[PDB]
Amino acid sequence: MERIVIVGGGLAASRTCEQLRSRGYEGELVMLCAEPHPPYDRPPLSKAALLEEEHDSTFPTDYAQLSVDVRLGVAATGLVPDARTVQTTDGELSYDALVIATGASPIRLPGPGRQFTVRTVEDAAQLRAELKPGQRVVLVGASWISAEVATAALRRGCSVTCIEAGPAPLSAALGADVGQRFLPWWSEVDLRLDTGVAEVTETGVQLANGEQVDADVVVTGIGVRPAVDWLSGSGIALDTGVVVDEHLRTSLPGIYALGDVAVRWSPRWNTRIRVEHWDDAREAARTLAGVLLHDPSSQDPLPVHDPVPYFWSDQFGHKIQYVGHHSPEDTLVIRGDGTPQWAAAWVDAEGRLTAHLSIDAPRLMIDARMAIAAGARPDEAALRDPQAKLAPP
Ligand SMILES: Cc1cc2nc3c(=O)[nH]c(=O)nc-3n(C[C@H](O)[C@H](O)[C@H](O)COP(=O)(O)OP(=O)(O)OC[C@H]3O[C@@H](n4cnc5c(N)ncnc54)[C@H](O)[C@@H]3O)c2cc1C
């Protein structure tokens, strides 16, 4: 029997298994999971897992009925493409095709003190146990994850401080103009802008000042880095992530990658995109399955993955929807400026809609997503009215 080996045990790995089976794959499937848990969903870790009574985010995938050999507590540590062999913490195994789906790891600060990052079920459970009335929580970075952790900490009675090097919350992701508009949402947080953090100390954090800010709990949310250090020396093309083409093929034949670990050339956006988004990992698994099962005698084209990216965040009681891929070079146009129903659009030098941000208004996002896909060039009157449809029929 042929053998496809999937390295990693999250959304991309689980969904690739389902897709490979639904689309006719009858060979062997082995999944190498570094974690000692069946794959589970991550968006809930900073949401339900902190706040709700029930929060088991394990996927419904039935690996017994899909004849998937799931190997828990086994991490890949090396790759020998010429031998079609992967090295792991539990020994060697060979493959006929290999899928890299190891996700990304949180960036952390230096220092000796206790420092939480949100990536596993253990992280969320131990962080939840520390979010209690009378606790001082310091969040490093005014990021999506920090905003979500801040929400849960406030609801559980914590004092929250958030230290951001940039000029406004979410400035790294959305820019200073848009981020500045979210300040009222942070009104219950001790938010310190334009402030760098040097390290996590035994008693809290130390600012670039050298000044200290005491804390009972420190949570760092300053981004993630693809988990690719095990690929060192394999000769695979890397660029802060595994480089794949629009068909999720790496630089080496028979080896594929998708999800948070992957950096993908996008014909649409004319650059490499490193978008750690739930929807992008999930959608890529369907494309990847189609690529792997492409009958060689068939003359059909090879499936492509180049969607308009989508991301959401649940914070401060609201729902933020973001679609597209804007550059700092793009022009920001606020929709409904001066009204509570405002949204944000970005257009390029040719007037083409590149991205759109809405709040509690998915109808606006859905229309914007199709407008971006179509390359729509809405006029100023349409952009300034939040309710105006931007997509062609
Ligand atoms: C707290 C949190 C909240 C989020 N909220 C949102 C949200 O609201 N909306 C949104 O769109 N996105 C959200 N995301 C992003 C989204 O969850 C990710 O894009 C998605 O999980 C990526 O799936 P993946 O399978 O590529 O990676 P992961 O889900 O990270 O899976 C990778 C798995 O492989 C394992 N692994 C790592 N190294 C190895 C190795 N060497 N060998 C074997 N296994 C290994 C990891 O332990 C992990 O189990 C959030 C992410 C986090 C962390």
XYZ file of all heavy atoms in Angstrom, residues 199-281, unseen atoms left out:
627
model
N 12.013 42.344 28.896
C 12.040 40.961 29.351
C 10.918 40.726 30.347
O 10.378 41.668 30.943
C 13.391 40.613 29.993
C 13.665 41.345 31.272
C 14.986 40.922 31.928
O 15.646 40.029 31.381
O 15.356 41.487 32.977
N 10.632 39.442 30.568
C 9.732 38.991 31.625
C 10.562 38.649 32.856
O 11.364 37.711 32.842
C 8.886 37.797 31.170
C 7.923 37.371 32.267
C 8.150 38.141 29.889
N 10.379 39.405 33.937
C 11.153 39.174 35.149
C 10.398 38.225 36.084
O 9.269 37.805 35.822
C 11.444 40.492 35.862
O 10.204 40.993 36.379
C 12.056 41.516 34.882
N 11.026 37.889 37.205
C 10.366 37.039 38.190
C 9.072 37.641 38.724
O 8.163 36.894 39.100
C 11.320 36.773 39.351
C 12.469 35.845 39.009
C 11.994 34.457 38.634
O 10.980 33.989 39.199
O 12.629 33.836 37.761
N 8.958 38.970 38.768
C 7.809 39.636 39.377
C 6.909 40.347 38.381
O 5.901 40.933 38.785
C 8.295 40.649 40.412
O 9.168 41.588 39.769
C 9.044 39.952 41.517
N 7.237 40.307 37.098
C 6.419 40.978 36.113
C 7.152 41.143 34.804
O 7.711 40.176 34.276
N 7.138 42.365 34.263
C 7.868 42.665 33.039
C 8.699 43.912 33.277
O 8.373 44.749 34.117
C 6.953 42.836 31.816
C 6.005 41.644 31.720
C 6.207 44.111 31.883
N 9.796 44.015 32.543
C 10.662 45.187 32.562
C 10.542 45.889 31.215
O 10.665 45.242 30.164
C 12.113 44.803 32.836
C 13.042 45.987 32.952
C 14.491 45.565 33.092
O 14.849 44.848 34.020
N 15.330 45.999 32.160
N 10.253 47.193 31.249
C 10.101 47.961 30.028
C 11.473 48.273 29.441
O 12.491 48.158 30.117
C 9.353 49.252 30.315
C 8.051 49.120 31.089
C 7.404 50.495 31.337
C 7.094 48.222 30.327
N 11.490 48.675 28.166
C 12.716 49.167 27.553
C 13.321 50.267 28.389
O 14.541 50.442 28.374
C 12.442 49.685 26.142
N 12.483 50.998 29.139
C 12.959 51.988 30.098
C 13.952 51.401 31.076
O 14.849 52.104 31.542
C 11.785 52.548 30.914
C 11.197 53.784 30.316
O 11.558 54.178 29.207
N 10.277 54.412 31.045
N 13.800 50.122 31.415
C 14.343 49.580 32.639
C 13.365 49.621 33.794
O 13.595 48.956 34.811
N 12.275 50.375 33.663
C 11.217 50.378 34.664
C 10.484 49.043 34.673
O 10.419 48.333 33.664
C 10.232 51.512 34.392
C 10.809 52.890 34.648
C 10.131 53.595 35.805
O 10.448 53.261 36.969
O 9.274 54.475 35.551
N 9.947 48.692 35.837
C 9.267 47.419 36.025
C 7.770 47.652 36.150
O 7.329 48.699 36.627
C 9.776 46.703 37.279
C 11.298 46.575 37.351
C 11.795 45.261 36.766
O 11.072 44.235 36.779
N 13.024 45.281 36.234
N 6.994 46.661 35.728
C 5.545 46.644 35.912
C 5.208 45.296 36.534
O 5.350 44.259 35.876
C 4.781 46.846 34.596
C 3.294 46.932 34.869
C 5.269 48.095 33.892
N 4.773 45.303 37.794
C 4.503 44.062 38.502
C 3.296 43.365 37.902
O 2.397 44.003 37.348
C 4.256 44.336 39.983
C 5.505 44.755 40.705
O 6.594 44.629 40.113
O 5.386 45.224 41.856
N 3.268 42.043 38.036
C 2.167 41.264 37.491
C 2.089 39.927 38.210
O 3.119 39.371 38.592
C 2.343 41.024 35.975
N 0.863 39.420 38.387
C 0.661 38.054 38.847
C 0.688 37.077 37.686
O 0.978 35.899 37.870
C -0.675 37.932 39.592
C -0.744 38.815 40.812
O 0.228 38.795 41.594
O -1.749 39.541 40.960
N 0.387 37.546 36.488
C 0.278 36.709 35.296
C 0.769 37.527 34.110
O 0.295 38.645 33.890
C -1.171 36.229 35.044
C -1.201 35.307 33.820
C -1.683 35.503 36.251
N 1.691 36.981 33.327
C 2.164 37.634 32.113
C 1.792 36.750 30.941
O 2.070 35.547 30.957
C 3.681 37.887 32.139
C 4.135 38.492 30.827
C 4.034 38.806 33.291
N 1.160 37.353 29.942
C 0.746 36.675 28.724
C 1.335 37.440 27.549
O 1.117 38.648 27.422
C -0.784 36.590 28.588
C -1.099 35.642 27.377
C -1.397 36.108 29.859
N 2.110 36.767 26.710
C 2.767 37.416 25.575
C 2.056 37.077 24.280
O 1.821 35.889 24.005
C 4.216 36.964 25.472
O 4.882 37.427 26.627
C 4.893 37.504 24.249
N 1.662 38.127 23.540
C 0.982 37.985 22.269
C 1.615 38.869 21.215
O 1.012 39.867 20.788
N 2.817 38.502 20.766
C 3.538 39.333 19.810
C 3.839 38.575 18.519
O 4.839 38.842 17.842
C 4.838 39.865 20.443
C 5.750 38.703 20.824
C 4.547 40.730 21.648
C 7.035 39.142 21.523
N 3.001 37.618 18.180
C 3.080 36.934 16.905
C 3.533 35.485 17.036
O 3.824 34.966 18.117
N 3.623 34.839 15.876
C 3.984 33.434 15.789
C 4.987 33.238 14.660
O 5.049 34.015 13.703
C 2.720 32.555 15.568
C 1.706 32.777 16.684
C 2.102 32.844 14.208
N 5.763 32.160 14.775
C 6.735 31.798 13.752
C 6.516 30.354 13.310
O 6.428 29.442 14.166
C 8.163 31.978 14.286
N 6.443 30.097 12.001
C 6.276 28.715 11.532
C 7.236 27.744 12.200
O 8.410 28.046 12.434
C 6.551 28.805 10.027
C 6.090 30.208 9.648
C 6.421 31.071 10.885
N 6.725 26.546 12.464
C 7.488 25.509 13.155
C 8.227 24.682 12.105
O 7.728 23.648 11.639
C 6.561 24.647 14.005
N 9.433 25.129 11.737
C 10.175 24.556 10.615
C 11.606 24.202 10.991
O 12.359 23.710 10.154
C 10.165 25.493 9.385
C 8.741 25.753 8.891
C 10.848 26.790 9.747
N 12.004 24.409 12.235
C 13.388 24.143 12.590
C 13.767 22.686 12.375
O 14.939 22.398 12.117
C 13.622 24.564 14.033
C 13.422 26.055 14.232
O 12.256 26.464 14.409
O 14.411 26.827 14.178
N 12.802 21.765 12.422
C 13.107 20.366 12.128
C 13.489 20.127 10.671
O 14.082 19.087 10.368
C 11.918 19.487 12.500
C 10.687 19.669 11.679
C 9.783 20.662 11.788
C 10.222 18.816 10.613
N 8.773 20.483 10.869
C 9.026 19.359 10.132
C 10.709 17.653 10.030
C 8.305 18.776 9.103
C 10.003 17.070 9.034
C 8.803 17.634 8.567
N 13.177 21.060 9.769
C 13.508 20.938 8.357
C 14.915 21.423 8.036
O 15.348 21.289 6.890
C 12.472 21.719 7.528
C 11.052 21.173 7.656
C 10.026 22.143 7.122
C 10.966 19.818 6.933
N 15.639 21.967 9.011
C 17.030 22.355 8.802
C 17.827 21.207 8.191
O 17.776 20.070 8.667
C 17.651 22.778 10.137
O 19.039 22.591 10.119
N 18.557 21.511 7.122
C 19.423 20.548 6.487
C 18.761 19.653 5.471
O 19.464 18.867 4.808
N 17.436 19.731 5.333
C 16.737 18.882 4.383
C 16.852 19.393 2.965
O 16.561 18.643 2.027
C 15.247 18.781 4.728
O 14.605 20.035 4.602
N 17.266 20.642 2.792
C 17.311 21.241 1.478
C 15.991 21.791 0.991
O 15.913 22.274 -0.146
N 14.948 21.737 1.814
C 13.663 22.293 1.428
C 13.733 23.812 1.475
O 14.417 24.400 2.320
C 12.558 21.766 2.359
C 11.184 21.910 1.694
C 12.578 22.535 3.660
C 10.101 21.063 2.331
N 13.015 24.455 0.557
C 13.025 25.909 0.460
C 12.250 26.511 1.618
O 11.065 26.205 1.807
C 12.420 26.356 -0.873
N 12.919 27.377 2.380
C 12.326 28.014 3.545
C 12.474 29.525 3.450
O 13.465 30.027 2.929
C 12.974 27.542 4.870
C 12.865 26.068 5.210
C 13.603 25.796 6.526
C 11.435 25.617 5.299
N 11.497 30.252 3.997
C 11.497 31.713 4.020
C 10.584 32.155 5.157
O 9.512 32.715 4.922
C 11.034 32.288 2.679
C 10.948 33.811 2.693
O 11.445 34.429 3.656
O 10.365 34.391 1.749
N 10.995 31.901 6.395
C 10.131 32.055 7.563
C 8.835 31.277 7.348
O 7.734 31.817 7.329
C 9.839 33.527 7.855
O 11.048 34.289 7.751
C 9.271 33.682 9.255
N 9.006 29.991 7.118
C 7.926 29.124 6.718
C 8.319 28.265 5.528
O 9.254 28.595 4.784
N 7.564 27.204 5.275
C 7.834 26.357 4.118
C 7.265 27.030 2.874
O 6.055 27.267 2.789
C 7.233 24.960 4.307
C 7.594 24.071 3.112
C 7.755 24.343 5.637
N 8.115 27.275 1.874
C 7.645 27.923 0.647
C 6.880 26.905 -0.194
O 7.393 25.822 -0.504
C 8.811 28.529 -0.152
C 8.316 29.232 -1.419
C 9.642 29.501 0.723
N 5.641 27.240 -0.550
C 4.849 26.408 -1.439
C 4.360 27.285 -2.576
O 4.254 28.508 -2.447
C 3.654 25.742 -0.724
C 4.177 24.783 0.378
C 2.691 26.779 -0.146
N 4.045 26.636 -3.696
C 3.364 27.301 -4.795
C 1.858 27.277 -4.563
O 1.377 26.789 -3.545
C 3.735 26.659 -6.132
C 3.294 25.210 -6.271
O 2.456 24.743 -5.490
O 3.798 24.519 -7.207
N 1.100 27.802 -5.526
C -0.350 27.865 -5.430
C -0.987 26.496 -5.317
O -2.187 26.422 -5.038
C -0.931 28.552 -6.677
C -0.216 29.826 -7.103
C 0.871 29.592 -8.154
O 1.919 29.039 -7.810
O 0.663 29.954 -9.329
N -0.231 25.421 -5.569
C -0.725 24.052 -5.433
C -0.225 23.348 -4.170
O -0.372 22.125 -4.030
C -0.340 23.262 -6.677
C -0.567 24.015 -7.948
N -1.738 23.929 -8.672
C 0.235 24.874 -8.624
C -1.644 24.701 -9.741
N -0.461 25.289 -9.732
N 0.337 24.100 -3.231
C 0.803 23.594 -1.936
C 1.983 22.616 -2.090
O 2.304 21.831 -1.177
C -0.329 22.943 -1.138
C -1.519 23.816 -0.724
C -1.036 25.204 -0.286
C -2.566 23.921 -1.800
N 2.675 22.664 -3.224
C 3.865 21.846 -3.431
C 5.067 22.612 -2.902
O 5.195 23.814 -3.171
C 4.049 21.514 -4.914
C 2.882 20.748 -5.495
C 3.130 20.377 -6.944
N 3.295 21.558 -7.798
C 3.330 21.506 -9.126
N 3.227 20.332 -9.743
N 3.478 22.615 -9.830
N 5.920 21.925 -2.129
C 7.174 22.518 -1.698
C 8.176 22.439 -2.840
O 7.853 21.986 -3.938
C 7.730 21.804 -0.471
O 8.243 20.544 -0.871
C 6.632 21.555 0.583
N 9.422 22.849 -2.567
C 10.490 22.768 -3.556
C 10.920 21.335 -3.843
O 11.691 21.115 -4.772
C 11.702 23.573 -3.074
O 12.206 23.012 -1.846
N 10.450 20.357 -3.088
C 10.894 18.977 -3.258
C 9.726 18.122 -3.708
O 8.641 18.192 -3.096
C 11.454 18.430 -1.923
C 12.643 19.203 -1.335
C 12.885 18.772 0.109
C 13.879 19.003 -2.169
N 9.927 17.273 -4.718
C 8.798 16.491 -5.231
C 8.267 15.524 -4.182
O 9.010 14.959 -3.379
C 9.380 15.758 -6.454
C 10.867 15.742 -6.229
C 11.174 17.027 -5.478
N 6.958 15.339 -4.194
C 6.325 14.453 -3.244
C 6.134 15.030 -1.857
O 5.591 14.342 -0.982
N 6.561 16.268 -1.623
C 6.457 16.919 -0.322
C 5.610 18.178 -0.473
O 5.823 18.966 -1.397
C 7.841 17.263 0.253
C 8.693 16.013 0.301
C 7.676 17.865 1.671
C 10.059 16.225 0.977
N 4.648 18.349 0.428
C 3.645 19.404 0.379
C 3.602 20.087 1.738
O 4.109 19.569 2.731
C 2.264 18.840 0.027
C 2.263 17.992 -1.250
C 2.722 16.687 -1.229
C 1.828 18.504 -2.443
C 2.748 15.912 -2.362
C 1.849 17.728 -3.616
C 2.298 16.434 -3.555
O 2.335 15.658 -4.700
N 3.015 21.276 1.780
C 2.848 21.987 3.040
C 1.654 22.923 2.948
O 1.301 23.396 1.859
C 4.113 22.773 3.390
N 1.034 23.181 4.106
C -0.156 24.024 4.156
C -0.374 24.511 5.589
O 0.178 23.953 6.557
C -1.416 23.290 3.658
C -2.010 22.248 4.615
C -3.405 21.757 4.079
C -1.069 21.044 4.859
N -1.221 25.542 5.721
C -1.539 26.051 7.048
C -0.541 27.068 7.579
O 0.187 27.746 6.842
N -0.541 27.200 8.905
C 0.290 28.221 9.521
C 1.772 28.044 9.230
O 2.514 29.020 9.363
C 0.109 28.234 11.014
C -1.118 29.030 11.468
O -1.896 29.507 10.618
O -1.255 29.168 12.703
N 2.227 26.827 8.878
C 3.650 26.601 8.607
C 4.098 27.093 7.239
O 5.309 27.197 7.004
C 4.006 25.105 8.741
C 3.501 24.297 7.557
C 5.464 24.895 8.900
N 3.169 27.410 6.347
C 3.457 27.573 4.931
C 3.489 29.048 4.538
O 2.775 29.888 5.080
C 2.408 26.852 4.082
N 4.378 29.365 3.617
C 4.456 30.671 2.970
C 4.198 30.419 1.494
O 4.941 29.656 0.860
C 5.827 31.331 3.191
C 5.889 32.683 2.546
C 6.091 31.455 4.699
N 3.200 31.106 0.943
C 2.646 30.796 -0.362
C 2.764 31.975 -1.321
O 2.296 33.084 -1.029
C 1.164 30.396 -0.191
C 0.434 30.093 -1.477
C -1.015 29.613 -1.205
N -1.918 30.710 -0.836
C -2.267 31.006 0.413
N -1.804 30.285 1.431
N -3.080 32.022 0.639
N 3.293 31.709 -2.508
C 3.208 32.708 -3.558
C 1.749 32.867 -3.977
O 1.040 31.874 -4.157
C 4.048 32.328 -4.764
C 3.727 33.226 -5.895
C 2.933 32.932 -6.975
C 4.158 34.588 -6.078
N 2.842 34.018 -7.799
C 3.594 35.042 -7.287
C 4.978 35.459 -5.354
C 3.812 36.344 -7.786
C 5.184 36.749 -5.848
C 4.616 37.171 -7.057
N 1.294 34.107 -4.112
C -0.072 34.407 -4.530
C -0.030 35.185 -5.822
O 0.339 36.375 -5.797
C -0.806 35.218 -3.464
O -1.897 35.925 -4.018
N -0.472 34.600 -6.944
C -0.629 35.399 -8.164
C -1.498 36.599 -7.928
O -1.240 37.657 -8.497
C -1.258 34.416 -9.163
C -0.830 33.076 -8.682
C -0.734 33.170 -7.178
N -2.543 36.456 -7.123
C -3.498 37.540 -6.938
C -2.828 38.753 -6.312
O -2.972 39.878 -6.803
C -4.656 37.056 -6.049
C -5.779 38.068 -5.859
C -6.710 37.641 -4.724
N -7.231 36.284 -4.886
C -8.277 35.976 -5.648
N -8.912 36.920 -6.306
N -8.701 34.726 -5.735
N -2.130 38.548 -5.194
C -1.537 39.649 -4.453
C -0.117 39.987 -4.889
O 0.447 40.940 -4.353
C -1.544 39.318 -2.962
C -2.907 39.004 -2.470
C -3.419 37.777 -2.160
C -3.935 39.949 -2.212
N -4.711 37.905 -1.746
C -5.064 39.227 -1.799
C -4.035 41.331 -2.358
C -6.265 39.848 -1.480
C -5.219 41.938 -2.023
C -6.315 41.204 -1.594
N 0.482 39.217 -5.806
C 1.816 39.512 -6.339
C 2.881 39.522 -5.247
O 3.841 40.295 -5.305
C 1.796 40.849 -7.081
C 3.004 41.053 -7.977
O 3.494 40.116 -8.618
N 3.485 42.288 -8.036
N 2.746 38.637 -4.265
C 3.764 38.509 -3.231
C 3.587 37.164 -2.534
O 2.689 36.382 -2.860
C 3.694 39.667 -2.221
O 4.812 39.586 -1.307
C 2.385 39.603 -1.418
N 4.476 36.884 -1.587
C 4.331 35.721 -0.725
C 3.496 36.136 0.482
O 3.751 37.171 1.112
C 5.676 35.163 -0.268
C 6.454 34.420 -1.384
C 7.865 34.082 -0.962
N 8.580 33.379 -2.040
C 9.822 32.930 -1.935
N 10.508 33.146 -0.798
N 10.383 32.312 -2.983
N 2.489 35.346 0.809
C 1.604 35.665 1.925
C 1.819 34.646 3.025
O 1.919 33.450 2.741
C 0.131 35.696 1.498
C -0.214 34.497 0.628
C -0.152 36.993 0.708
C -1.530 34.656 -0.137
N 1.899 35.127 4.269
C 2.159 34.333 5.474
C 0.998 34.704 6.396
O 1.148 35.503 7.320
C 3.531 34.624 6.122
C 4.615 35.006 5.118
C 6.018 34.981 5.726
N 7.066 35.032 4.699
C 7.328 36.100 3.949
N 6.612 37.209 4.106
N 8.293 36.060 3.030
N -0.179 34.166 6.098
C -1.416 34.552 6.767
C -1.837 33.392 7.659
O -2.399 32.392 7.205
C -2.514 34.928 5.767
C -2.040 36.095 4.881
C -2.911 33.738 4.900
N -1.569 33.523 8.948
C -1.956 32.505 9.922
C -3.437 32.659 10.251
O -3.808 33.265 11.267
C -1.114 32.626 11.188
C 0.283 32.046 11.055
C 1.304 33.044 10.551
O 1.153 34.254 10.843
O 2.268 32.603 9.886
N -4.281 32.095 9.368
C -5.734 32.196 9.466
C -6.362 30.806 9.465
O -5.937 29.933 8.694
C -6.344 32.977 8.281
C -5.863 34.384 8.146
N -5.253 35.065 9.176
C -5.919 35.245 7.102
C -4.947 36.284 8.770
N -5.339 36.417 7.515
N -7.407 30.639 10.292
C -8.164 29.395 10.338
C -8.664 29.017 8.954
O -8.458 27.890 8.492
C -9.338 29.561 11.303
C -10.057 28.284 11.631
C -9.731 27.366 12.598
C -11.253 27.799 11.002
N -10.644 26.321 12.582
C -11.581 26.564 11.610
C -12.060 28.277 9.959
C -12.691 25.806 11.223
C -13.168 27.527 9.578
C -13.470 26.303 10.213
N -9.366 29.936 8.286
C -10.020 29.606 7.020
C -9.017 29.199 5.952
O -9.292 28.299 5.153
C -10.842 30.792 6.529
C -11.519 30.528 5.206
O -12.396 29.635 5.163
O -11.164 31.217 4.221
N -7.829 29.813 5.954
C -6.840 29.506 4.918
C -6.281 28.093 5.073
O -6.111 27.369 4.086
C -5.699 30.524 4.948
C -4.686 30.299 3.829
O -3.896 29.341 3.903
O -4.696 31.078 2.861
N -5.976 27.684 6.300
C -5.577 26.304 6.530
C -6.673 25.335 6.120
O -6.401 24.329 5.459
C -5.231 26.091 7.998
